[PDB]
Amino acid sequence: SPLSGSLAPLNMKGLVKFQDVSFAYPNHPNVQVLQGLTFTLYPGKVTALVGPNGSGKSTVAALLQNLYQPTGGKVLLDGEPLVQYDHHYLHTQVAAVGQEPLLFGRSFRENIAYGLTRTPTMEEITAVAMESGAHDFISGFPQGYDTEVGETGNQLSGGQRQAVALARALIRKPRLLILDQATSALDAGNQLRVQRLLYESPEWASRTVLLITHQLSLAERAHHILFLKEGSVCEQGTHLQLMERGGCYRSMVEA
Ligand X SMILES: Nc1ncnc2c1ncn2[C@@H]1O[C@H](COP(=O)(O)OP(=O)(O)OP(=O)(O)O)[C@@H](O)[C@H]1O
Binding residues (CB under 6 A) for ligand X: these are: 25, 28, 33, 51, 53-59, 153-160, 185, 187
Nearer to ligand X (CB atom), residue 43 or residue 131: 131
Considering only CA atoms, which of 135, 87, 138, 136 is closest in space to residue 115? Answer: 87
Nearer to its own copies (CB atom), residue 14 or residue 159: 159
For residue 130, give Cα distances in angstroms to 14, 139, 159, 189, 207. Answer: 26, 10, 14, 12, 21
246 binds Mg ion (CB under 5 A): no
Min dist. Cβ of residue 235 to ligand X (A): 16
Kindly indicate which of the ranges 13-21, 100-108, 153-161, 169-177 contains the residues binding its own copies, using the contact rule CB under 8 A. 153-161
Residue 31 contacts residue 54 (beta carbons within 8 Å)? no
Among 36, 54, 101, 115, binds its own copies (CB under 8 A): 54
231 binds its own copies (CB under 8 A): no
Beta bridge partners of 178: 96, 210
Among 76, 103, 192, 243, binds its own copies (CB under 8 A): 192
Instruction: Output the CA torsion 131→146→168→170 (10° steps).
Output: 30
For residue 40, give Cα distances in angstroms to 10, 43, 161, 179, 233. Answer: 22, 10, 31, 17, 11
188 binds its own copies (CB under 8 A): yes
Residue 215's binding partner among ligand X, Mg ion, its own copies, none (Cβ under 5 to 8 angstroms by kind) is: its own copies
Rounded Cα–Cα distance for residues 203 and 241 (Å): 28
Residue 79 contacts residue 63 (beta carbons within 8 Å)? no
Nearer to Mg ion (CB atom), residue 58 or residue 92: 58
Rounded Cα–Cα distance for residues 145 and 125 (Å): 9
Kindly indicate which of the ranges 56-64, 107-115, 143-151, 247-255 contains the residues binding Mg ion, using the contact rule CB under 5 A. 56-64
Among 153, 200, 202, 240, binds its own copies (CB under 8 A): 153
Min dist. Cβ of residue 98 to ligand X (A): 10
> By rule CB under 5 A, what string of x and - marks binding of each residue 118-157 to Mg ion?
---------------------------------------x
The helix-helix angle for 158-171 and 122-132 (nearest 10°) equals: 130
Residues at the site binding Mg ion, with contacts judged by CB under 5 A: 58, 157-158
